Each structure stands twice: as structure tokens, then as C-alpha cells.
Design a protein around this ligand. Structure first.
Ligand SMILES: *[C@@H]1O[C@H](CO[C@H]2O[C@@H](C)[C@@H](O)[C@@H](O)[C@@H]2O)[C@@H](O[C@@H]2O[C@H](CO)[C@@H](O[C@@H]3O[C@H](CO[C@H]4O[C@H](CO)[C@@H](O)[C@H](O)[C@@H]4O[C@@H]4O[C@H](CO)[C@@H](O)[C@H](O)[C@H]4NC(C)=O)[C@@H](O)[C@H](O[C@H]4O[C@H](CO)[C@@H](O[C@@H]5O[C@H](CO)[C@@H](O[C@@H]6O[C@H](CO)[C@H](O)[C@H](O)[C@H]6O)[C@H](O)[C@H]5NC(C)=O)[C@H](O)[C@@H]4O[C@@H]4O[C@H](CO)[C@@H](O[C@@H]5O[C@H](CO)[C@H](O)[C@H](O)[C@H]5O)[C@H](O)[C@H]4NC(C)=O)[C@@H]3O)[C@H](O)[C@H]2NC(C)=O)[C@H](O)[C@H]1NC(C)=O
Ligand SMILES: *[C@@H]1O[C@H](CO)[C@@H](O)[C@H](O)[C@H]1NC(C)=O
Ligand SMILES: [Ca+2]
Ligand SMILES: [Ca+2]
Ligand SMILES: [Ca+2]
Ligand SMILES: [Ca+2]
Ligand SMILES: [Ca+2]
Ligand SMILES: [Ca+2]
Ligand SMILES: [Ca+2]
Ligand SMILES: [Ca+2]
Lengths: 468, 4, 470, 467, 467, 4, 4, 4
């Protein structure tokens, strides 16, 4: 009879297992024999305390590097305030050692954990590209808890080399199965930030993960957006428990917070899933998350059912990750058909936005062509527009099957007059729906100011597979 | 780039 | 016994077969039984006259589409000046039907030829992406004889979707072997244009092809650059012959000119090579071109030998394509090792360019890492700089083995004050060299004017492999 | 004797009159019989509630128009957050009706007040040009409390048609005497914005007005720059009084704030001045402001005396406006000599700014030519330069007589790499000085960062007269 | 009574006095006693050989200056090729001395002639501004035979300071009557250049002058456009006579060519007109040119009659200048009413140009406003558009009274993808018409290529008067 | 353009 | 884009 | 600027 961890803080890890059956259902995966054996996970952050008593046992030099110092040692730079404890805390959540009488345990406590020190300095394009593409054939999963500023005023994403790294990793990583990039959706909730304005979380190459409080509420730091895929527990208000993990200076903390705690927990769960089926492709993994994530017990004011009967929320994606279900579905999973990419120009003849603009277009989804799609995966609405007050805009995309995705909600702190230039707002909400039919783009000025601008380009890019 |  | 084409204009196709032997040596490939059977080539241009008497026989609807009109019919739009005859002329050079008593023959006269009408209208990013990614598993080779303005003033390249199309095609096309993109290097010679300022020819995903006149000289329209890979014959001065091919309105022309005639000729030769070995990857193909191309009988004032003993020219790349050699070396070719990508940041601290600037850096080429490279393929010198008069700049990159690549030569008509923003000047001149050692970047003001500027970023990206064995 | 207004809120209008002599000293002008009679003022903003109980009496349809909707009615668009109350508030400060038992009174309570609705929509070049050039021979004074974004990151100014409107109005307005354009200097203080990066306030055609708190301190929203001409009171911290005026929905407010309250108060004072002397040219008016404004009681850490003995500050220009003095000097005033314009190319050959750059040049100010100047008015330092981080630059201009004008102070939020393209930084601090001598331009990187750039053009344009 | 010049080359000056009675009709003006006395003209070019035997007599140091070298002496820089003979040739056409037994004579042979050396070096904004604004109250007429490159590929005009200079000179020059700026329309005919792409000739402040050959044909170098006002004779084909004037090294030439010969001849004629009436304003002068210019004998394929019955051509404006008529009409001229400026925003949203675009709008011409216009003068169609191949565009503007002005004809050498940014195409063809009614803008792709672009702004600016 |  |  |  499988014996759960004996670590001193395991009882405090309410999110791994805590009766109430209000957790990530990890114990069920462990019992089936899945704990991360043979899986390698790397934390792209400010470094990893490789000699930490609860990490040393699973530390992997091969999944580590210091890109900031161009050296193989990822040891964090120690400071009075412990500014560079971020990476270490994330590491522990993925693979803190189990049954060693120290702190708690990671989701994949038998996996190998490494760290890439790349945030402690100027984070250039080359630095991100080298981090994202480090040991594509040794590291299976990359966990990144960082991104553009979460002030609710910025629109930024990977540059040239990083963009190449993402595609390269997804195509050639893991011997062609594709690197798995797990991302924290963002902490700009209080600023009303939108994670669709974050090119890393908005990327189709990453599994953007959001948070939920112990009592199943939307955390105060949570950013809503249509690109989020799933959720994992994290910190909440003053009365809710937080995450337990390894901290700098060989310590143990019970107060790790934010979406930064959610991404690594997801990485751990994804690690268990890989052990259960090492042949899952980067796309297979996203399919598993969509099919097994549970919306139950997660409160939100926007749960909506899509065209294929699944509930989705802009705060939680498809719901809370379910380790047990993930592992179970992975075992007999048939790898998905080749990825098709259908590009359709909705308009290249300018249109005035004014107070509100609606663009409707009948789409055949490349019918009669090799990229014909009948089962959607990611959907990108590539917009190029000019507006005087960007944050006043709210953009929605409605699929033929009626699924209304909020590509962009109002951002009160965004006063930019720069608009958007070929920005690819991405939605996961129409996953598995048939794209054939009439699509509708909605752009509206949520303010009473008499704002103005022009939509000059709208390209709908559909990713997915052919009938089956 | 900011840590989360 | 091999009986050459009996077509009426075949004798005039001096570049396919000449009495002097100064040709593309395709007859040798044909004799070995390689004429393009089973290979599909698509011309990305202004359309293809699919009902042309010398094209109909090889026309392939599956390798065709009209992106400008979102329709499957690639028929060109007829006008008084026959403005849209470009695609048809290129098609004929690749696969004009043989022994049918009409006009001449294409290099791969038994290949299937298709056309994508995408230049007759607004050529948007989405248009290019749909063209480059059309039937990745049916079309083997794409031939593109177009690019940014060749006025010697512009710096432009593929945008977001096209860039994705290129990599997607090279990764997933041909069932994972990679789509083969053949490109015309440019006709801005008279304007002193540089093809390294053309993101399509400068791309590592394309085989950029230049031209040579009948007497082996640098054509007047030829643009020099380090990204060019090989050459094919084409038009020259008033006393030199030109290319024979299918023209609009079911006609036959003996006066096709420019690098637009060279790219399709190269596509044809690449079609023969694929028939000889259907399993060559997009990289394997580039390796074959580098190894077989002949610098013989091609005049240039810049032939230089690289670190591995091969002669290279900024006007001809590695030389004239050799169909016979290509096909010969292709047959029992061993696919190359996995591609490694080493990114190295040379300079973080800004640097005054002034009159002249030299940046030297010792490079280990990712020694001790998974992307360690000891055998180079493409090399990109990614520069971000500001200058007041761009055209006055001349940039050179010197490999540890001493190969000096001209990344950018002076462009007298370029008065831009925009500089370069992460522009990846690419060189094929250090192919197969060991990248370990000291690299040198040289930036100089070729003018006597008081120009000024700053080099703010220089990232060296090395593509290649590591000499294994097992 | 003269009787002061009986309006219910007049006592609350501490800036018009108070126990302390810390006011605009308007009462003294009123007593002399100057209250705005015969003068027409127009508020270029989001509209004017023309039937407001404290505005209706002085409302003038001829000084009004709705450029946003191409219609003559300037009524503002009503919204629950009263977004378009800006114009009405400014109108009341200029000419709210007096002795009518409602709210307070305007500085020129007998002047006619109009409004141009032009900010409630896309503010195009044509919109600004039509607004600035509305009834040049009926409207004497235009009051504009708006401008480019005050985020401390932008550099913007009038476009082609608006630039034409400005010069056209200054040349042909008021039958050739010139339209008087009063401008609010900006509310980007908290962002460390510089009003020299605002082409409207930085224009020589406008009287840029700054603010001072009730206790004579630099308001938190105040932007410093060398183009500011004078100051008027306005809001300050939580312990200082604010401006009283007419608000939307026929209400009365005691909490109008910002430089938007200062411009209209200045327009009112300028209206009184015009009544006292209808023949003052647009330049005459600026001369009066320079000569009569008072530094006294206005606290700043940069008060400096210029070459002619006057104290100037980048926060207050020449000081607080003095209605009494303005009106007094206007009566005994001889219209100034014709304006001369001396253009001098300082450097056409590039220079590396690097960490610090100093350009010295001996200037004869067009000696021996028709544009010879011996008494300065406006001074423009036209710069064209490239730099990697604009906000790190600090630019100073020193006149032969030693007056150091800060053309541009550091703007921490300005990360632009666009530099400046023939931007005319303007200074009013050398007014009346003799321009002959050596001028010095100073450009310095105030940051420890490794910035870089080049100054490619420096044209000094001198405006002024000869005896 | 009056005796015509006895100068040796006067007989060769066929354009002045010719028994074909096919000339500029200057003799008629001379006879009435108008030869330029008291009028000052300045040539803005590469300098003037002030000691030339046929110029010295009329040379005026006060109308001269060397802006290139910041010195008063305008002497041209001598070169083996005499590259800098341009200014001297123009000077002679305006005021070469008469009856002195040397060369020929100028149109205003008793006027004072000066020269500004400003083209022999970098022609900066400041240089143009100082040249255009040199001695506004001493120089009456400025003659400029230069402009942006005439390659049929460029769109360029005056920069910030030059723009100011133009407006300043027109407002304050000649004691407020306005400086008169005469401009050569351009020699890019062979390149199919359009003078509406030249901001100097396209300016309303300048009288743009075109050429006509001896036999009354459109010269091969002639550029057509709607901004040209009138014409004067000049060189033509190998079988037609050319202009006689003073050349460098104290020589005399009979082969001066191009529109550069036309502008100075027009300046001379305008000098005679000023002597006949010193109080004509810069606008009065343009009115005289419009009313007195004779289309007769000028061959063109586009003569069209406008809404007020006058014939106009894009090659000749209103026709050949008539010195006699000019002087005659000047004497009895009543200065025109004040200039109104009506700005009207035409578009409500972006229009796709595609293959062809037509924009129609009903215009009231500021009815009910101070700028209401009933009699047009200049008309500007301010366009902001993007297109992939600029030279393929042809733009037309049709006035309510049916006058179709070609704002832009195809320029086969223009491959620019930069479009136009608030470019003010100007037409003089609707002069005196009533602007009230429906205006129509036409933009068409004259090529078979499938070009594309967007018109994002169209502002119609009407200049003129009311009764 | 912003109101002040 | 121009044809070559 | 070119002379004409
Ligand atoms: C590319 O690639 C391709 C392929 O690939 C492949 O390759 C290979 C090679 C490898 O590499 C792999 O891996 C790969 O995959 C190629 O191709 C190839 O080629 C080759 C060449 O090189 C070839 O081979 C050859 O062959 C021939 C034959 O022919 C053929 O063909 C035909 C038709 O046409 C037919 O009929 C036939 O049958 C054939 O066939 C074939 O077969 C096979 C089987 O084997 C199969 O498999 C296949 O499939 C088929 N195919 C076809 C083609 O068809 C021949 O001729 C030759 O032979 C020769 O040589 C050899 C070697 O060198 C030798 O051998 C020898 O043999 C013997 C027996 O006899 C032996 O002994 C033995 O041993 C054992 C041990 O274990 C025990 O001890 C016993 O007891 C003993 O007996 C030895 O060992 C061997 N050696 C060796 C080295 O191996 C033979 O013999 C021969 O020889 C000759 O002989 C003759 C007669 O005898 C002589 O002559 C004479 O001489 C005298 C003197 O005294 C006098 O003079 C007289 O007059 C005369 O007559 C001579 O001299 C000799 N020589 C020598 C050299 O020695 C061979 O086999 C193949 O086949 C192919 N394959 C295919 C797939 O195709 C290609 O090439 C490539 N290309 C490039 C790019 O390079
Ligand atoms: C994965 O694929 C390999 C073939 O590469 C196969 O041998 C192996 O059994 C598969 N394992 C799983 C878990 O699917
Ligand atoms: Ca533990
Ligand atoms: Ca965010
Ligand atoms: Ca044939
Ligand atoms: Ca080129
Ligand atoms: Ca009142
Ligand atoms: Ca400001
Ligand atoms: Ca004479
Ligand atoms: Ca021209």
C-alpha cells in the first residue's frame, strides 16, 4: 500500500493532498507509481541553490547553467534581502526531495531538477534564446515564472532569437517530440493586466498556467485572458494558506505566492504525465490538459461552455490540473494527427473603430487545401490597429460555434497611443471546435471619452487537425 | 523582465 | 543510348548544352536517367500559363494556387505590356516539355510544374506565408524570383508569418526532410545593391542563386553579397546570348534575363538531384551545392580560398552549378548530422563607429555544450547600429581561419539614417570551417564625409555540426 | 467708493482678494473701473454650459462654436462622471457674472465669454486651426487649458495648419494688433515633465502661464521650463484652498485645480488690461506681463536675476500676475517697435555629445543688418540631435549677459531614442537683454549610464527690437 | 516720343520687342514711362557679378548678400566651367542697363538689382530663410530660379524656418504690403515631373512662372501643374531663339534657357507694375497676373475655361504675361478685401484608393462664419495617403463650378512607397469662382499593375474674399 | 491632447 | 516586392 | 536644391 511522504511539512502542503479532495490530486498519481523517475525539469529564473538540503538529491547539472555569467554553475547571487530566491522556491515545488525529513516534497519528487540563472542581469534576446534552448534533448520540461512587466500598461513578447528558440524547441526538442514550456500567467491582477498582452504566456508554444486560492477563488494578482490553458493552486488572501517550498540559505518557506508558484506545480504534474507516457508530443500534452482539467470548486463569474461542451474561464482556462486524470489519460493516449495551420486574411482594407466595430467573415478553414482544419487547437487573431487610448479597448472573438473569447479586456492604466502591430491575441477556448462558419471580431471603446482609431489588419490563424 |  | 532533346530551340539553350562545354552540364545528368520524374516544383510569382503548349504536359494543379484571388487557378492576368509573363518564363526553365517540337526544354523536363499567383496584387505577409507554405508535402521545391526593391536603398525581409512559413517548411515540409526554397539573388547591380540587405536571399532557409553571363562575367545587374550560395548562367551584355523559355500567350522567348532566369534553372538542377536521392534534407542539398559547384571559367575580381580550401566569390558564391556532379554526389549521400545552433553575444557595451571600428572576440563555439560546433554551415552576424548615412558603411566579418566575408559593401544610393535593427547579415563563405578561435568584425566609413554612429549589439549566431563517427 | 462683489462665494475666492496681499490684486483694477467691458474671451476646450446661471449673462455666441460637431452650439456633452466640465470651469474663472447672488465672480466679470468645443473628439490639426482662428476680429483673447500628454515622455507641438493659425492670428487678429493666446503650462510635474517639450506653451505666440499654491509654493503638478512667462494662483496640497468657479449642471465648485485654473485667470487679467488700453499688440501684452509680474511671496529654489535686473524662475516665469500693475502700466504704454528676427547658425558640422558638450559662439545679433537686435524678446535654441535615452539629457543656454536658461531638464520617464528634430526650445528669461556677445549651449548626460549621441544642428533665433 | 533701347543685342531680344507682336509687350509699358525706377529686385541664386558692365549701373548692395559665406559681397565663385553663372544671367534679365552700348537690356532696366549668393554650398533651412527674408523693407521683389531636384521622383518643400520666412515676408515685407516672391516652375519636363510636388512653386506665397517657346509651344523642360500662375517666353527646340542676358566674366550670352529665364523676366514685369502702383499688396499682384495674362497664341492640349470664363492651362497657368496690360490695370487698381481662410475637413473615415477613388462633399465655404468665402483665390487640397507606387497616381480636384484641376499627373520615375503626408496640392485654376457647392476629389491608378493604398485625410483649404 |  |  |  503506497506510503505518502513523511516529510515534516508535507501535511502543510494542502494543495498536493489534504482530504477535502480540494487539491491537485497528486497522491493518486504517486500511488500508480508516477513520481517523476527519469524526467528532467529546468527552472528558468534567477538561479538555483543546488546544495539545498531538499534539492541536492535531485539536482541535475545537465539541466543547469548560468547564462548571466556564461558559466555552468547556476548558484544564485546572495544578497541581504534574498532578492534571488525566486528560482530556488520554484525548484522545490517541482522536485523537492521526499522522505528525507526536510521541509516538504515536490510534485515530481523523483524527477531531476536543474536551474538556469538568466534573470539576474540584462535579460537580452540572446539570453532568453540560450535559456529556452538549453539541452533540448536532456531537459524535457522548462518552467518559466517571469515575463514582461505586469503594470497593466505594457505589450511585449519574445524577440527574434527567442521566438526562434520556442519554435526550434517545440520542433526538435526531446528528439522531435517537442520541448514543453510551462509559463506563469502573470501577477498584474491588481493593475487589471491582461495576459494576452504577454507574448510568452500568449504563445501557442507555452502552457500558460493561472492560479486559484485555497478556497477556490480568483487570486487578487490573477490576470484574466483567453490564452491561459489551466490552473493550479497558489496563495490568496490573508486567511488562505500558501505554498510550501525550499527557500534560499537552505531554509524552508510556507509563504511562496503568486502565479510563480503555479507554473512549477504544473511542471511537476506534467513531469508525472511524461513518466506515464514518454512519447507525448508538446501538443499531446496540451490536449491532455484541456481534457482533464477540472473547473469544479473553482469560483469565477465567467465560466462558459464552448462548442464541444467544455467549461472554460478567462481566469482558469479549462480548470484545475488533475494529476491523477492526467496520468491516467496519458497511458493510453494516441499521439495527435499532424498540425495544420490555416491562415486567413479577414481584411486588409482599413475600417474605422470609433465607438464600436464589428467584423464578420465566413471562414471555410482552408477547405479543399492541405491545411484544412475541422478540429481546432490554438486560434490567433492577429490585429494591427491604431487607437488614441489603448487601455480603453475591449476586443472579443466569437467562433462559428458561438464561443466568445475575450482577446483583450480594458486596462485602465494603459494610456498608450501606439496601438497594436500584428499582435497575435491567442485563445484556447475554441479547442476542438470546428472552425468552419462565420467568425466575428468585436472591438469597442469601453470608455465614455470620444476615442478614435483604425483597424488596418485582421488575420485569423487557425491551428488544428483534419477530421477524426 | 520581472519574476513572478 | 541517350538521345538529347529534339525541340526546335534546344540548340539555342547554350547554357544547358554548349559546343564549348561552358554550360550547366545537365546532359550528363539526363544521360544517367535523371530528368525530374516524380519531382514537383512550384513557381511563386505572377501566375503560370498552365495551358501553354510547352507547359501543359507537365502542369500540376496540386503545385498551383492563386493567392491573390483566393482561387485554385493560377492563370496570369493578361495586359497590353504582358506585365505578368514573369511566372510563365520561370516555369519553362524548370520544366518545359521535351521532344514535343515546341520551343526548348526545361532542366527537369520530366518534373511536374506548378505556379502560385501571388505577386499580382498587394503582397502581404499572409500572402507570402500562404505561398511559401503551399502543399508542403506535395511540392518539393519552391522557386522565387522576387524580393524587396532592388534600388540599392532598401533593407527589408520576411515579416512574422513568412518567417514562420520558412522555418515551418524547412522543418515539416517533404515529410520532415524540409522544403527547398530557391531564390534569385537580385537585379540591383547597377544600383550597387547588396543582397545581404534582402532578407529572403539572406535567409539560411533559401538557396540564393546569382548569375553569370555567357562568357563567364559578372552580369551588369548582379548584386554581390556573402549569402549567395551558387550561380547559374543568364543574360549579359548585348553580345551575349540569353535564356530560352516559355512566354505568355503561348509564345517562346529567347530573351529572358536577370537573376530571375537563374533561380528556376537552379530549381531544375535541384529537381534532378532530388530524383537521384529523394531523401536529401534541405541542409543536405545546400551541402551538395557547396561541394559540387565549380568556380571554373567564371571571372570575378574577388575569388578567395576559404579555410577548407574552397574558392568563394561574393558574386558567385561557390561557383557554377554542376548538374552532373550534383546528381553524382547525391546518389549515395550520407545525410548530415543534426543541426546545432550556437548563439554568442559579442558586445553588450555600445561602440562608437566613427571612421572605423574593429571588434575582436575569442569564440569557443559553445565548447562543452550541446550546441558545440566544429563544422560550420551558415553564419549570421546580427548587428544593431545607428549611423547617419547607411550607404557609406562597409562591414566585414573575418573567421578564425582567416576567411573575410563582406557582410555589407557601400551602397551609394542608401542615404537612410535608420541604421540596422538586429539585422542578420549572413555568410556562407565559412562553410565547413571550424568556428573556434578569434572572430573579427570590421565596420568602416568608406566616405570622406563626417559620418557618425554607434554599434549597440553584435550577436554571432553559428549554425553547424560536430565531426562524429560513432 | 467702489463696491466689491456680493456673490456668495466671492469671499472664498482668496486669489482675487484676501486679508493678506497674497492675491492677483484684481480688486485694485476693478476699483479703477476695469472689469472687462467690451472685451471678448473664448475658452478652447470641451464646450461651455452657455445657460449656466453664472455664465448666461456674459455668454457670447459670437465667441463660440462646436468644431467637433461642425455646429455653432458649444454645449458640452453630458456624462455621469462629468468628463466634459473642463470648459465650463474655465469660463467661470474668466467671466462668471458678478452681483447676481450666484457662486462667485470671474476676473473680468463684465467681459463677454464664449466657448469652443474642440477637445471632445479627435483633435486634428484642422480642428486646432479652426479653433485658434475662430473670429479673429471679434474674439480678443483665447484661453487654452490643454496640450500634449503630460506623461513626461512626449515631445509634440502644433502641426502645419495650427502653426499657420498661430502666426495668422498674431498678425491679422484684432485688426492687426494680434490675437492673444493664453496657455496653461502643464500638469506633468509629478512625472518631471518639461513644458519646453510642449510646442503650444513653448510657442512665442502664446503666454504660457504656470501655477502657485495658496501658500506660494510650487504646486505638485507644476512643470518647470524657460518658456513660461508668468504665474497665477491655483490648487496645491490638501491643506490649501482651490479655485472657485462654475461647474457642469448649473453647479458651483470650490475645487477646480491644476494649471487649467491658472490660464483662464490670466486671460481675465489680460482682459482687464485690454479694456485699459485696447491698442496693445500681442507683443505689447507680453512686455506688460514681464514688467509688472511679481516674484514676491512665490517660493522656489531657482530664482535668478537676469541681465536687466529682473528675477526669473523656471517654475513661475517672471512671477505672479498683478492686475493692478498691469492695468496701470497699460494706460501709460507706447506700443513697441517693430519685431526683428535674427537667425544665426551656430553649428552645422556634427558634434558628439557623449557625457558633456559645450558649444560657445560669438554672436553679433545681425549687426549692420535690418534685423539687428539690441533688446531681446523671445529666444529660440533650435536643436537637432540624436541620443539613445532622451530623458537623461539636460540642456542649458547662457546669454552673453550671463542668464542661464534651462532649455531641458532631465525627464526620468523619457526613454525615447528619437532625439530632437529642429525643436525650438524657447526662453523668456533674457527678455530685454542685449544679445550681442558670446552664447553658450550646454548639453549633458545627467545619468551614470553609457549614453551616446550627436548634436547635428544648433540654430539660435533671436526675436527683439533695436532702439 | 519714347525711344527704344539702342543696345547692340536688343534686336535679338525677340521676347521683349518683336515685329511679330508675339512677345511680353514690355515696350508698351516703357512708353508709358514705366521702366523700374525706384523698384528693387533681388536674385536668390549662386551670386551676382556686381561689376558686370551691364549690371554695375543698377547694382544695389542693399539688395545683396552672401549667405553661403556670411558676408555682404555676393560675387560668384569663379570656376573653369563657370558653374556659378546662374545668378548673373537672371540679374541681367531683370535689370541689365539700357542704352549703354552693352549686350541687351532688362525688362526693368531702371530698377535696382541685387543678388543673394545662397546656392553655392549647403542650402540649409536657415540659409533659405535668411535669403527669403533679406531686407524685407528695401527689396520689393525676390526672384528664385531653383527648387527641389527635378528628377520627377521627389516631393519636397520649404522647411520650418523657410515656411516662416515666406509667411513673414508676405505679411510684413514692403511695410506690410508683402514681399513678392517670383519662382521658376521647374525644368523636369523630360522626367514628367509635376510642379505641385515642389513646395516652393506650389506655395501660395509665390508667383510660380512657366515657360513657352518662341513659337508658342510647351518647352521640352516644362512641368505641368495646377499651381502655376502665368508664363513668360524662354528657350525651346534647336530652331527657336533663346534669352539674351549678362553672363559670367563680363560676357553677354544669347543662349540662356529653361524656366530660370522665365522667372526673372516675370520679376521685371512685376517691377514695372509696382512702379505704376507702389501700393499693390502681394495678393493684388497675383490678381493682376490672373486678369491680365493672355492665353492667346500659346499652344497646349489642355486649355480649359473655368467658372468665371477665363482660360487656364496646366502648362501656362493663365497665359503669357502682358507688361502693358499689367501696368494699365495696376494704375486703376483698388486693393483687394481682407483674405479669408476657410478650412474644411472632408473625410469621415479612411477610403480605399485601390484602382480608383472618388470623394464628393458639399461645401458651404464657411457660410455664416467670419471666413465665409464667395470669391476664391488659392485652393489647397491637403492629402495624407499611403500607396505602393506613388508615380502611378493621378489626382484631380473639381470645383462646384466644374473646373477640373489636375493636382497630380502620373510620374513614371516616381517609385516611392512613402505616399504623401499632409501635402498641400494647390490650384490657381478656380480663382474668383464661388466655392459653395459640391467638390470632388479623384484619385486613380493610371497603371495596369494592381497597386494599393489608403487616403487617410483630405482637408480642403479655401483662400479668398467675401463682398 | 489632454485637458489641464 | 518586385519581380526579378 | 538645383538651379533652373
Ligand atoms: C551507389 O551505391 C550502389 C549500391 O549501394 C551499395 O553498394 C555496395 C557496394 C555497398 O556499399 C552497399 O552497402 C551499398 O548499399 C552502388 O551499386 C553497386 O555497385 C557495385 C560496384 O561497386 C556493384 O557490384 C558489382 O556488381 C557487378 C555485377 O553486376 C551487377 O548488376 C548486373 C546488372 O547490371 C547483374 O546482372 C549482376 O548479377 C550484378 O547484380 C548485383 O548482384 C548483387 C549480388 O552480389 C546484388 O546484391 C545486387 O542487388 C545486384 N544489383 C545489380 C547491380 O544488378 C560485378 O561485376 C562486380 O563484381 C566484381 O567485383 C567484385 C568485388 O570487387 C568481385 O567480388 C568477389 O567475388 C568472389 C566470387 O567470385 C568472392 O570470392 C568468394 O569469397 C567468399 C568469401 O566470403 C568465399 O571465400 C568464396 O569461396 C569465394 O569464391 C570475393 O570475395 C569477392 N570480392 C569482393 C571484393 O567482394 C567479383 O568477383 C567481380 O570481380 C570481377 O570479376 C570479373 C569476372 O571474373 C573480372 O573480369 C575478368 O577479369 C579477367 C582477369 O583475369 C579478364 O580481364 C577478363 O577479360 C574479365 O572479363 C573482373 O576483373 C573482376 N573485377 C574485380 C573488381 O574484382 C560487383 O559485384 C553492385 O551490384 C551495385 N549494387 C547495386 C544496389 O546496384 C553504386 O555503384 C554506387 N554509386 C556510386 C555513387 O558510387
Ligand atoms: C515510445 O516510442 C518508442 C519508439 O521510438 C517505443 O519503442 C516505446 O515503446 C514507446 N514508449 C511509450 C511509453 O510510448
Ligand atoms: Ca523533503
Ligand atoms: Ca501580465
Ligand atoms: Ca519543348
Ligand atoms: Ca537586391
Ligand atoms: Ca456670480
Ligand atoms: Ca507638459
Ligand atoms: Ca545694356
Ligand atoms: Ca519639379
Amino acid at each position: 500500500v503506497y506510503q505518502e511522504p513523511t516529510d515534516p511539512k508535507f501535511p502543510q502542503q494542502w494543495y498536493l493532498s489534504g482530504v477535502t479532495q480540494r487539491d491537485l490530486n497528486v497522491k493518486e498519481a504517486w500511488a500508480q507509481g508516477f513520481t517523476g523517475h527519469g524526467i528532467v525539469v529546468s527552472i528558468l529564473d534567477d538561479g538555483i541553490e543546488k546544495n539545498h538540503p531538499d534539492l541536492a538529491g535531485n539536482y541535475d547539472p545537465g539541466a543547469s547553467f548560468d547564462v548571466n555569467d556564461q558559466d555552468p554553475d547556476p548558484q544564485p547571487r546572495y544578497t541581504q534581502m534574498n532578492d534571488n530566491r525566486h528560482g530556488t522556491r520554484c525548484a522545490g515545488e517541482v522536485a523537492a526531495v521526499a522522505n528525507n525529513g526536510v521541509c516538504g516534497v515536490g510534485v515530481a519528487y523523483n524527477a531531476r531538477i536543474g536551474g538556469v540563472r538568466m534573470l539576474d542581469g540584462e535579460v537580452t534576446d540572446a539570453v532568453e534564446a540560450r535559456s529556452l534552448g538549453l539541452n533540448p534533448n536532456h531537459i524535457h520540461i522548462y518552467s518559466a515564472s517571469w515575463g514582461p512587466e505586469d503594470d497593466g500598461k505594457t505589450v511585449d513578447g519574445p524577440a527574434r532569437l527567442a521566438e526562434e528558440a520556442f519554435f526550434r524547441g517545440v520542433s526538435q526538442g526531446r528528439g522531435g517530440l517537442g520541448s514543453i514550456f510551462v509559463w506563469a500567467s502573470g501577477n498584474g491582477g491588481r493593475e487589471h493586466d491582461s495576459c494576452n498582452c504577454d507574448g510568452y504566456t500568449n504563445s501557442i508554444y507555452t502552457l500558460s498556467i493561472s492560479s486559484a486560492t485555497q478556497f477556490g477563488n480568483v487570486p487578487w494578482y490573477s490576470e484574466a485572458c483567453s490564452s491561459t490553458l489551466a490552473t493550479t493552486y497558489s496563495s490568496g488572501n490573508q486567511n488562505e494558506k500558501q505554498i510550501v517550498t525550499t527557500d534560499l540559505r537552505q531554509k524552508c518557506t510556507e509563504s511562496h505566492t503568486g502565479t510563480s508558484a503555479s507554473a512549477p506545480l504544473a511542471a511537476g504534474i506534467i513531469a508525472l504525465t511524461l513518466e506515464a507516457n514518454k512519447n507525448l508530443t508538446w501538443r499531446d500534452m496540451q490536449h491532455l490538459v484541456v481534457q482533464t482539467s477540472k473547473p469544479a470548486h473553482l469560483n469565477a463569474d465567467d465560466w462558459a461552455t464552448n462548442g464541444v461542451g467544455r467549461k472554460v474561464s478567462h481566469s482558469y482556462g479549462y480548470g484545475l490540473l488533475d494529476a491523477g486524470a492526467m496520468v491516467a489519460l496519458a497511458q493510453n493516449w494516441t499521439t495527435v494527427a499532424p498540425q495544420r495551420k490555416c491562415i486567413v486574411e479577414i481584411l486588409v482594407e482599413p475600417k474605422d473603430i470609433g465607438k464600436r466595430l464589428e467584423v464578420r467573415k465566413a471562414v471555410t478553414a482552408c477547405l479543399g487545401e492541405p491545411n484544412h482544419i475541422t478540429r481546432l487547437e490554438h486560434v490567433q487573431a492577429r490585429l494591427t490597429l491604431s487607437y488614441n487610448r489603448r487601455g480603453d479597448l475591449a476586443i472579443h472573438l466569437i467562433s462559428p460555434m458561438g464561443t466568445r473569447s475575450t482577446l483583450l479586456a480594458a486596462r485602465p492604466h494603459d494610456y498608450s497611443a501606439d496601438g497594436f502591430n500584428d499582435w497575435a491575441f491567442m485563445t484556447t477556448h475554441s479547442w476542438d471546435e470546428d472552425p468552419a462558419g462565420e467568425w466575428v471580431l468585436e472591438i469597442e471603446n469601453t470608455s465614455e471619452a470620444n476615442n478614435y482609431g483604425t483597424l488596418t489588419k485582421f488575420t485569423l490563424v487557425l491551428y488544428g487537425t483534419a477530421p477524426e | 523582465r520581472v519574476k513572478r
